[PDB]
Design a protein around this ligand. Structure first.
Ligand SMILES: [Zn+2]
Ligand SMILES: [Zn+2]
Ligand SMILES: [Zn+2]
Lengths: 75, 82, 96, 156, 84, 143, 96
């Protein structure tokens, strides 16, 4: 079997391994909810990248990753 | 089913936008009463959805758990940040 | 994929081949690019002959061994088989 | 073009394009702090297609690419970081240069995203690999290579 | 423009779409394998997209793309086209 | 020998190069071994110690092209009846010759000319423009 | 489709034409009267570079043709300490 002519659709996205800041549920290109009206990105050892303000507030609350039970560590 | 999925995605985006609006207003004011904050949130989001008061109060209740907005020690009507 | 440096005296040949293939394909490639009948090509990989039907992945060199950077040497000979007289490369000039 | 062909270098050696790709470029605290943000993807491209030497060297040794790949806001400012690295590389930047500390732009890349973008745009050549092997092995190349290639080993 | 002559065996027309702009997503967990007769085309387009529009990853949507088929066993009654 | 920068005699190497580039730009036959040897000659001329003979090679090539285009121009003017056919034939020959010259002089174009000046293919086309068509522009246009 | 690369020390390295067109000098040598050799072999006579450096640049032709997309990672190219400064001039001459 073979295909004489084909039509396809592709959803291009940035090659970054992290997609969204899972605190404010905002994309990382724009600013955090605290930061929309008036920012850097904080990574983690567990490949968890979130907004700097969101990470600061979260670590002010507790030293637990928002997704899994791991101790938060800077980069 | 897809219509219901879209009408629930609009609710989720509505909740996120309400939380963002509450945080922005409480960072532009740093203190507001409940009766004024609800009206300010409604007035800010009018080009988009008209938000039901239950949704704004649920968002302002769940932002307390995230400590973005906190109730002042004088009364629960007053609001502040931390 | 597996990359090979098939040597025959001076005439050195760089050939890509697949692991899931036989030395039949290798012989056909070398006779096509050497203009020789496809029966006198006798490979002498590490001085030991190999069967004409067995796959070259089982012959001793794998994909992780005969990488493009350093292809595995496969000596060659033709019927007059001829003695293996693979000439070595030029001597590098002493030390850095 | 008239300015960029005067080779305007600051006191640290930054040419007019090192600053346009530098995060630590002084923007005035007055109303220029809003509109004028550096690094700028449009200023860099304008300088590049107006004739800027993309392989210009800082007095520290860093090229125009050793500075953009040190950018400390990669994911927040991807569009600026992406478009500058695209502009430099396809505008003639040599993505293997070593500064006076003998560090490639990948070595002087304090960011995983910058490393990914540069490795996507890094075109390999045997001249670069051979020059890297000559420099790393401390081979005395003076008076044994083309004079134009002495510089090529020099920035490796 | 490539060095070797590329025999796609296809008239490849694609719609490259922004991930965040379009309301589309890879919600199904289907592990659909790309057909081998057009896997060459998809690999060539992956290479082209990496070459020109670098820094971007492609998440192909296999349930919104259609194409014609060849009926070499059904009896060759003209042609037909369905989705992948 | 090897690719180490030698001290080459410009006269003999340039005479050999003159022979091969005359036979190239005239679309005559040169041995493939000779062509691959004059790549080495070009490299040696563009690298040699104590002074890189790149600018001298460029100037000598420009002078040879000027003389060749002037010779073609004089022959074409001599053939006044078939000026048009002669221009077409010698333009085909000189276009292929300029292409093969930009191929043979790739080291000059990539290492000396681009690092100002103009490449040998561009130089040959410019010499043809300024010495073959521009002088006898009126004859070509009228015919 | 298979070009021959004769070295200075006699050695004749046969590599694919697509492989050996990644070097500007070989692309120029096969563009012109050098293409008029035919015989399907399209040989080039490198009277300058010795056998080991020509072997290394042929292995680099293979290495670059293989790892040109760089989907995940390109493994290091093993330049010997003695072969460098002689492969550097070779890679400059060939414009690799
Ligand atoms: Zn922020
Ligand atoms: Zn956030
Ligand atoms: Zn985590």
């Amino acid at each position: 079997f073979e295909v004489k002519k084909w039509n396809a659709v592709a959803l291009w996205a940035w090659d970054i391994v992290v997609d969204n800041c899972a605190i404010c549920r905002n994309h990382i290109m724009d600013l955090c909810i605290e930061c929309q009206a008036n920012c850097t990105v904080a990574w983690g050892v567990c490949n968890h990248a979130f907004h700097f303000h969101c990470i600061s507030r979260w670590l002010k609350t507790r030293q637990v990753c928002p997704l899994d039970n791991r101790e938060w560590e800077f980069q | 089913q897809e219509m219901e999925q879209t009408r629930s995605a609009v609710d989720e985006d509505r909740k996120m936008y309400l939380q963002a609006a509450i945080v922005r207003i409480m960072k532009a004011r740093k203190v507001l009463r409940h009766n004024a904050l609800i009206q300010e949130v409604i007035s800010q989001s009018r080009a988009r959805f008209n938000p039901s008061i239950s949704m704004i109060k649920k968002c302002i209740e769940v932002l307390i758990d995230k400590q973005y907005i906190e109730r002042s020690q004088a009364s629960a009507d007053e609001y502040s940040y931390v | 994929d597996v990359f090979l440096m098939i040597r025959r005296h001076k005439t050195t040949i760089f050939t890509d081949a697949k692991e899931s293939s036989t030395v039949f394909e290798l012989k056909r490639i070398v006779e096509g690019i050497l203009k020789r009948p496809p029966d006198e090509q006798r490979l002498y990989k590490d001085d030991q002959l190999l069967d004409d039907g067995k796959t070259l992945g089982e012959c001793g060199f794998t994909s992780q061994t005969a990488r493009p950077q350093a292809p595995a040497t496969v000596g060659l000979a033709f019927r007059a088989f001829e003695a293996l007289c693979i000439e070595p490369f030029s001597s590098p000039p002493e030390l850095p | 073009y008239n300015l960029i062909h005067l080779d305007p270098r600051t006191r640290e050696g930054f040419t007019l394009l090192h600053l346009a790709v530098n995060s630590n470029t002084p923007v005035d605290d007055f109303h220029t702090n809003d509109v004028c943000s550096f690094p700028n993807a449009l200023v860099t491209k304008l300088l590049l297609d107006c004739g800027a030497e993309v392989n210009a060297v800082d007095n520290e040794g860093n090229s125009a690419l050793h500075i953009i790949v040190q950018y400390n806001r990669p994911i927040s400012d991807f569009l600026t970081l992406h478009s500058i690295i695209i502009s430099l590389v396809e505008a003639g930047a040599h993505t293997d240069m070593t500064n006076k500390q003998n560090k490639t732009p990948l070595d002087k890349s304090t960011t995983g995203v910058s490393e990914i973008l540069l490795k996507t745009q890094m075109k390999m050549s045997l001249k670069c690999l051979a020059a890297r092997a000559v420099r790393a092995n401390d081979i005395n190349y003076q008076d044994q290579i083309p004079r134009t290639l002495e510089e090529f080993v020099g920035f490796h | 423009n490539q060095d070797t002559v590329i025999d796609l065996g296809i008239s490849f027309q694609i719609y490259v779409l922004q991930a965040g702009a379009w309301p589309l997503t890879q919600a199904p967990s289907s592990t659909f394998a790309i057909p081998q007769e057009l896997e060459k085309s998809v690999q060539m387009f992956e290479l082209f997209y990496s070459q020109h529009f670098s820094g971007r990853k492609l998440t192909w949507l296999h349930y919104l793309c259609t194409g014609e088929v060849k009926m070499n066993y059904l009896g060759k009654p003209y042609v037909a086209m369905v989705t992948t | 020998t090897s690719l180490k920068p030698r001290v080459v005699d410009f006269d003999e190497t340039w005479n050999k190069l003159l022979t091969t580039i005359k036979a190239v730009v005239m679309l005559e036959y040169v041995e493939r071994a000779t062509w691959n040897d004059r790549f080495s000659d070009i490299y040696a001329l563009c690298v040699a110690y104590p002074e890189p003979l790149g600018e001298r090679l460029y100037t000598e090539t420009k002078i040879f092209l000027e003389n060749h285009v002037r010779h073609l121009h004089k022959r074409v003017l001599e053939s006044e009846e078939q000026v048009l056919v002669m221009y077409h034939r010698y333009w085909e020959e000189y276009s292929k010759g300029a292409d093969y010259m930009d191929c043979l002089y790739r080291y000059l174009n990539t290492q000396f000319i681009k690092k100002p000046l103009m490449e040998i293919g561009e130089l040959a086309l410019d010499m043809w423009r300024k010495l073959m068509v521009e002088p006898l522009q009126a004859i070509l246009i009228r015919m | 489709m298979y070009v021959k690369l004769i070295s200075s020390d006699g050695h004749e390295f046969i590599v694919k034409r697509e492989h050996a067109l990644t070097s500007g000098t070989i692309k120029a040598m096969l563009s012109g009267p050098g293409q008029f050799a035919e015989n399907e072999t399209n040989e080039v006579n490198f009277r300058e570079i010795p056998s080991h450096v020509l072997s290394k640049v042929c292995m680099y032709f293979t290495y670059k043709v293989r790892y040109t997309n760089s989907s995940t990672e390109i493994p290091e190219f093993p330049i010997a300490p003695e072969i460098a400064l002689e492969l550097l001039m070779a890679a400059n001459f060939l414009d690799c």
